[PDB]
DNA sequence: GCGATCGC
DNA sequence: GCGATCGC
């Protein structure tokens, strides 16, 4: 249970990896949707600032069909 | 502006 | 099927 830290509209936010729904790479933005206690949203961080657990989630998603 | 993607 | 997010 690691927390992903990201900036959204200037604010500092955090979401546990277990709340992440979908992860993808848009350019160098590791992007993701999540549902945090009813709050559905989207976040993104640079690949260079993403925690290993998020990158591993990303690799698992890149392995599957589109 | 572009990338990938979903809310609405 | 745009508008919207971030990183670049």
């Amino acid at each position: 249970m690691v927390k992903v830290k990201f900036k959204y509209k200037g604010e500092e936010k955090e979401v546990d990896t277990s709340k992440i729904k979908k992860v993808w790479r848009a350019g160098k933005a590791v992007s993701f949707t999540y549902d945090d206690n009813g709050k559905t949203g989207r976040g993104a961080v640079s690949e260079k600032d993403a925690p290993k657990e998020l990158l591993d989630m990303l690799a698992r998603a890149e392995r599957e069909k589109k």
Side-chain angles (χ1 to χ4, degrees), chain A residues 19-32:
Chain A
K19 315 292 187 174
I20 288 172
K21 285 164 64 178
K22 172 131 194 180
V23 183
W24 66 96
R25 198 216 293 167
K28 315 207 188 189
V30 177
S31 306
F32 54 87

Side-chain angles (χ1 to χ4, degrees), chain A residues 3-32:
Chain A
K3 308 180 225 151
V4 171
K5 285 233 73 165
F6 56 106
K7 184 173 296 187
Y8 175 74
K9 297 189 179 178
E11 179 185 8
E12 216 39 54
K13 284 286 173 189
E14 258 173 337
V15 62
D16 302 334
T17 54
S18 69
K19 315 292 187 174
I20 288 172
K21 285 164 64 178
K22 172 131 194 180
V23 183
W24 66 96
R25 198 216 293 167
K28 315 207 188 189
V30 177
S31 306
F32 54 87

Side-chain angles (χ1 to χ4, degrees), chain A residues 21 33-38 40-42:
Chain A
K21 285 164 64 178
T33 56
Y34 64 84
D35 181 333
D36 191 345
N37 189 36
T40 295
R42 184 189 288 211

Side-chain angles (χ1 to χ4, degrees), chain A residues 2 5 12 16 21-23 26-27 32-33 37-38 45 51-52 54-55 60-61 63-66:
Chain A
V2 55
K5 285 233 73 165
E12 216 39 54
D16 302 334
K21 285 164 64 178
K22 172 131 194 180
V23 183
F32 54 87
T33 56
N37 189 36
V45 297
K52 191 169 179 294
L54 184 64
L55 300 171
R60 286 199 286 284
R63 187 70 162 279
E64 3 206 302
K65 61 180 163 171
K66 298 198 67 178

